[PDB]
């Protein structure tokens, strides 16, 4: 291939040496070369090197100010040299250039936007002192509309710009991080950059809060605008990093608690034993001796837990044979009368919580829909019982009752209802330092299981269709007192769709025998086909499908368990803050700013000053701290030699 | 007496380090047994409550799940708690969910309870015991010599 | 507390300036200080430092040959300054010091040993020219331990091997062998010895990487019959040397002497008529196919088709076309065809036995498997011969007595067929896709064998306690069966043998729950036995079989790291077993003056290229752009001196 | 204060017996990481750096005569038992002291060891 | 014991300073030293 240089040109025979002299830093040579004032021998001071660098821009690349000033005194064309100086972070070049078609910068980029991008405190302050404004973020050439919007959000989300041009940096970081998270859902092509921009805004608030020196400052930041008003505001904005901070966690634990392994469980049990004593004491007389003792959040939490374990006890005692035979339409027993106050209290709590939020963010969590289902089932149970009591009477053998009888449905719904009641108790694991992180990371990897169900159910339906279509013409019901696969002799596994759908579910656990594929005829070809499809379903679901469900759970457990302490602490503080107020200090069985601104801003000014100091004066080292030491030595040598002669 | 001979494994260069790392991925299993016990109790409290009104003992030589013809699997709490345990290994038959009556609605609810317990404990609970055990062996073998 | 100073003193008030003068690069001040101190001025030119550095030591830290020369001009104690210069990587100071109780070096360290530790070609050469020696490696245990590791560390440096070794290839093969053996007997210093063995293995590969022609590579591997040095490189287990791209490319040219369905059909067609090629080679190996079978790839294909035909004959032995049930029968027509294959396998194993002299013959799994299979076949033949001349006649098979020779012969034959079909695994290393999988599947198999030591202990512990409880309830009234292998399982725990049998089948859930019952009303022993069974079930699958796969995952990560050199080593070992003559007939059948100069020239060129590459691999790799900055200021200083 | 008191330079300069302060301070910096659970990931690391210092200090031995003097200070192996009580796994699992301990323990091939061990164990009553 | 401990601490201090000072970071020192030497020579001549 006889190659050639396509679409280019040649610069000159003279200006090459001038560019070389500019590069080498020779002051005299480039001074005499430029002395062709108004009479030039066809040498352009605006020559462009083959890589696009210009003589003015070459001096910027070495941040050597003497030739910069010499060139500026001859009115060389700048165009965008200020942007280059800002991008390369040279204070002297920006100072000099601030008072005096091809561009490698996007046309909507302004010097302030790029300066905020570089996160250099000095240049941003220098530009702000002159007076600038970034367009507000608030469609024909959509490629540059999204790029322009992204650029101004990156400049807005910079710690340097926020620290010197915000009324309240603790508030402009909460809102801007919130809208950056929700803006990554409407622009899915740039979701990896919008969400990584919001994550850096959450770190800014935590770092700003890390600069507190005394507990006097910390309690004043979180109490701004009844108690812990700003701390609850951070929880609303999902600021996990800000909330899970050791200095504020210590204060929160001090409020919560207001000893060894065998010295704490025993006293917890001892306190929990007399649950109904300092609950009636509260109603009788709210005195400091007993009425105010339950006001401690730790004591209140224990009272609500022991009162719930008591409910689970006589719930287990209602299935005993000791406590109304097999009679039709019976009256409630003595256990159910004791059960009723707990159900009524739970329903009252759910009712008073229902209108407190208006079903927004109230039913969206998983720990409220289950409760709603539980109370709905309990209400259905009591309604069915009271309906059956007034329209049914007389002692009749239980075997003779027709199915769908109201009593049978009532007890079935009651049996279903109390399974959820006992499973709800797993939500208390988040208060223990050992089962807390394990349970939080347990329900977070569970969301990845829900996506394999969408393919498992499709495979199940696909195989059930074929099995039913093959076997639906061989069903029989003579000589069979019992019918189905839930029988001693399974006979009709694949006769109907409803039976085929559940005979394939029980085959995962190996509870379906191999003779259910036989028909009462000498048809060996169809039997073999049915057995082959059953075995193929067994192979796919148990050797392939379920083998790769665990193959990703450990590969997704790695990401979940990375930051598994922040999420657990957020859950624990959410649990804690629900016991800090008045209104819930009654277990369900027994329930049936002129100067404030002054102080806040004077503290915040010091906090911001410490943050910016630690960010600029303590980050030059993070190797680069000794690079300027050699420059200082060389400059001192040069000054001494020049001044001596 | 015969299970104490494993303590002598910490004298061989091959079986020594393996046994030490085995005893350290055992405090993780203990933490994971506080969930299975609660699930077992929650499901037993429902199954026994549903099936306790159909207890029969007429014309049977034996009575319980450890029989050639299993029966009365969910009659009592003691039998319900230990019949659910044996179902992890697949030693409980499907016909134990039937009753001596034509109450097709309650049998379906009981079978659904049994299947829901089987799904949670065997493909949702025993699969994330391996996930955290494999992700804790990495942090244990770094300091194992 | 009140912090104080322990076991230390102060230096001086006048020597601080003297020690700072040599630190800040001054020369006139150090010239004046030593000149004035001639007549015992009590300045103690040999001072100390908070770090413990004398005046001469500092001049070596910041390399200043002029200050060093000025210091050595006066009478100053040198001590171990040569070792400090060698370790501090100063060629000028070493050259100056070479021709001219508290130490930081162990008493066994010599300048040559430390230089070989530093691995510098120039310093080692300079020391070697003057004449040095290293003691030959063979009461105080600590000192005798850190005196043979230092010798071996200095003896395994690539620079010293390339400088003072007659044949650097052999001394890298042997050194890695001795270092890997020493790691076994030296349990404390095992990581240190195994790292040096790996270093010597990479040196040979890097030295072989500098072959610029196919004539130089064909001269190194054929030194001292064909591929003589390549076979010797395998005896020493040099995986990196063998698995080199040029070596593999050369070997593939002798192996072979297109899409998948353009080669599978060709292979099937070639293997279809292996008897024809065998006959042609046996009657007249002149032109037609007497050399076609000699090609390694064609010989491999013909040997695979013969073994596949043998496996097909074992499948036809069970067909009902090929006999009644009579004691001591005459061999069928199929077994007559099977006999030559067994005889050929026995002959091959016999002729392979004496080459190794029973040493390292039983080293690999496949040779032991072959021995077991051949012994089983021989036992089958012996029993079939015995049963023909003594226990003859015809009788219904239901009336035969167990331990009959005709039954043991069939059982032994049946067991032998499993081993001969599992031998087909060893052919997987010749495939690019099934090859690496089989290597990773056999190196973690030894990982499993360590977890089976604890399972045996647990099984024995639980079978000790189950039988002890259930042995008093044994009964066999009205029972045609006795054990767990029948429809009504009974006496599961009545004896130790059946207790061990029934505790193994419970892993797969083949033991019912009613076997824990007794013909009595004792409902307390039944519950105890059921609890023992359940506890055994718990810690065998949920616990013990879950950590078996937890460590399998984390041992597969290390195995798969270097999994392409091991597979290629195995494939080369498989390939060269077909290169030589002898065993080219399938089992169905067969029943140095002008030589060293060229090698020396090639070795000289290879060593020269290796040193040329290694000087650039270190002197250049942000370190190369550090000497230019010093050269610029040196030129500036020289120019200023010249003008001034 | 604790982060400054655990610095190796201060211990090596202002301690009578640095082998004991690296043992005592490493113990009370480990149990202190439990009462102050809020700041625990940094207390545990502080205690870990006090354990490697002892191992590095004991790694400076040159001859076996001085090694047997360090481990026998204050019956036999009085300081090796003291390190085990303080859970200094790095001070105990060092090659030099491992090699010394193996000589006391023992005071051959794969088939030459088992066949001798079984013979010794089969004649233990005598 | 005190003598052995003194030797051990001295060797540890030497090793610590050698490892901390030397470890690219040492390449800075030889530049400053030569710059200072050239500067001192220049002042001495002038
Ligand atoms: C799905 N199934 C099945 O439902 N029943 C029940 C039938 C009625 O009870 C089986 O009995 C069966 C089976 N699978 C196999 O064994 C294999 C396994 C893997 C195969 N291939 N694997 C691969 C993998 C990768 C690439 C290519 C192939 C394979 O080859 C084949 F036939 F193509 F599947 C067969 N058997 C046992 C059996 C084997 C042969 C015969 Cl003649 C009769 C029974
Ligand atoms: C827990 N269990 C159960 O106890 N028995 C015993 C009944 C007594 O004989 C079953 O037979 C059964 C079952 N589970 C399924 O199959 C699915 C599969 C996916 C599901 N959901 N997937 C998703 C995926 C994404 C999001 C949400 C859900 C699902 O949940 C469902 F469909 F809601 F019931 C059930 N079967 C088999 C069966 C299914 C349908 C029918 Cl009509 C009859 C039998
Ligand atoms: C080993 N076994 C067993 O052999 N059979 C067979 C008996 C005859 O067939 C069982 O039926 C059985 C069982 N295990 C459980 O359930 C648990 C699970 C976890 C436990 N503890 N977990 C922890 C975890 C961490 C720390 C401490 C404890 C536990 O407590 C116990 F018993 F102590 F193990 C029992 N059942 C079912 C059952 C339970 C209770 C009752 Cl009253 C009856 C049956």
From TrEMBL, chain A:
Enumerate the spans annotated as Transient receptor ion channel domain: 139-191
Q: ANK repeats span which residues? A: 107-138
Q: What is its main location?
A: membrane
What S-S linkages are listed for this chain?
482-487
Tell where it localizes.
Cell membrane
**Which terms are listed as keywords in the entry?**
ANK repeat, Calcium, Calcium channel, Calcium transport, Cell membrane, Disulfide bond, Ion channel, Ion transport, Membrane, Metal-binding, Receptor, Repeat, Transmembrane, Transmembrane helix, Transport
Where is the chain membrane-spanning? 265-285, 297-318, 337-355, 367-387, 408-429, 449-473, 494-516, 528-550
Name of the protein this chain belongs to? Short transient receptor potential channel 4b
The species this protein belongs to is Danio rerio (Zebrafish)
Q: Which gene encodes it?
A: trpc4b
Report the portion of the entire protein shown: 19 to 753 of 915
């Amino acid at each position: 291939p006889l190659r050639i240089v396509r679409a280019e040109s040649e610069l000159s025979t003279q200006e090459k040496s001038y560019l070389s002299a500019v590069e080498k830093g020779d002051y005299a040579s480039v001074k005499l070369a430029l002395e062709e004032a108004e009479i030039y021998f066809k040498i352009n001071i605006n020559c462009i090197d083959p890589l696009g660098r210009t003589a003015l821009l070459i001096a910027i690349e070495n941040e050597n100010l003497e030739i910069i000033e010499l060139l500026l005194s001859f009115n060389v064309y700048v165009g965008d040299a200020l942007l280059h100086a800002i991008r390369k972070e040279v204070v002297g070049a920006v100072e000099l250039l601030l008072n005096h078609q091809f561009s490698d910068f996007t046309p909507d980029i302004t010097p302030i936007i790029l300066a905020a991008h570089t996160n250099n405190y000095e240049i941003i302050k220098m530009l702000v002192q002159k007076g600038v404004s970034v367009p507000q973020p608030h469609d024909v050439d959509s490629l540059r509309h999204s790029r322009s919007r992204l650029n101004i959000y990156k400049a807005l989300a910079s710690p340097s710009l926020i620290a010197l041009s915000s009324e309240d940096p603790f508030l402009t970081a909460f809102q801007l991080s919130w809208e950056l998270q929700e803006l990554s859902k409407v622009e899915n092509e740039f979701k990896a950059e919008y969400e990584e921009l919001s994550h850096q805004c959450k770190h800014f608030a935590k770092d700003l809060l890390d600069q507190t020196r005394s507990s006097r400052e910390l309690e004043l930041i979180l109490n701004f605008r009844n108690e812990l008003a700003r701390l609850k505001l951070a929880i609303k904005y999902r600021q996990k990093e800000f909330v899970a901070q050791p200095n504020c966690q210590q204060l929160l634990a001090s409020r919560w608690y207001d000893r060894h392994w065998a010295g704490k469980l025993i006293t917890c049990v001892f306190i929990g034993l007399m649950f109904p004593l300092l609950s009636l004491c509260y109603l009788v007389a709210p005195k400091s001796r007993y009425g105010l003792f339950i006001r401690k959040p730790f004591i209140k939490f224990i009272c609500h837990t022991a009162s719930y374990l008591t409910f689970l006890f006589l719930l287990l005692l209602a299935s005993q044979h000791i406590v109304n035979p097999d009679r039709q339409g019976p009256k409630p027993t003595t256990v159910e009368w004791m059960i009723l106050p707990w159900v009524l209290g739970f329903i009252w709590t759910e009712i008073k919580q229902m209108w407190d939020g208006g079903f927004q963010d109230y039913i969206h969590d998983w720990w409220n829909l289950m409760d709603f289902v539980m109370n709905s089932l309990y209400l259905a149970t009591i309604s069915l019982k009271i309906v059956a009591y007034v329209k049914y009477s007389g002692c009749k053998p239980r075997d003779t009752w027709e199915m769908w009888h109201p009593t049978l449905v009532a007890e079935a719904v009651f049996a279903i209802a109390n399974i959820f009641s006992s499973l709800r108790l797993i939500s208390l694991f988040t208060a223990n330092s050992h089962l807390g992180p394990l349970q939080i990371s347990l329900g977070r990897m569970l969301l990845d299981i829900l996506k394999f169900l969408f393919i498992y159910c499709l495979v199940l339906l696909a195989f059930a269709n074929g099995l039913n279509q093959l076997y639906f013409y061989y069903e029989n019901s003579e000589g069979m007192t019992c019918k189905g696969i839930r029988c001693e002799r399974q006979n009709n596994a694949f006769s109907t769709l409803f039976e085929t759908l559940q005979s394939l579910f029980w085959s995962i656990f190996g509870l379906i025998s191999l003779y259910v594929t036989n028909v009462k005829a000498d048809h060996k070809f169809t039997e073999f086909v049915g057995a082959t499809m059953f075995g193929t379903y067994n192979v796919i679901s148990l050797v392939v499908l379920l083998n790769m469900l665990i193959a990703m759970m450990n590969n997704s457990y790695q990401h979940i368990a990375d930051h598994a302490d922040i999420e657990w602490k957020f859950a624990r503080t959410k649990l804690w803050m629900s016991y800090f107020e008045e209104g819930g200090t009654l277990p369900p069985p027994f329930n049936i700013n002129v100067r404030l601104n002054h102080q806040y801003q004077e503290v915040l000014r010091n906090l911001v000053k410490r943050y910016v100091a630690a960010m600029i004066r303590d980050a030059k080292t993070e190797t680069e701290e000794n690079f300027k030491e050699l420059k200082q030595d060389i400059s001192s040598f040069r000054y001494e030699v020049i001044g001596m002669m």
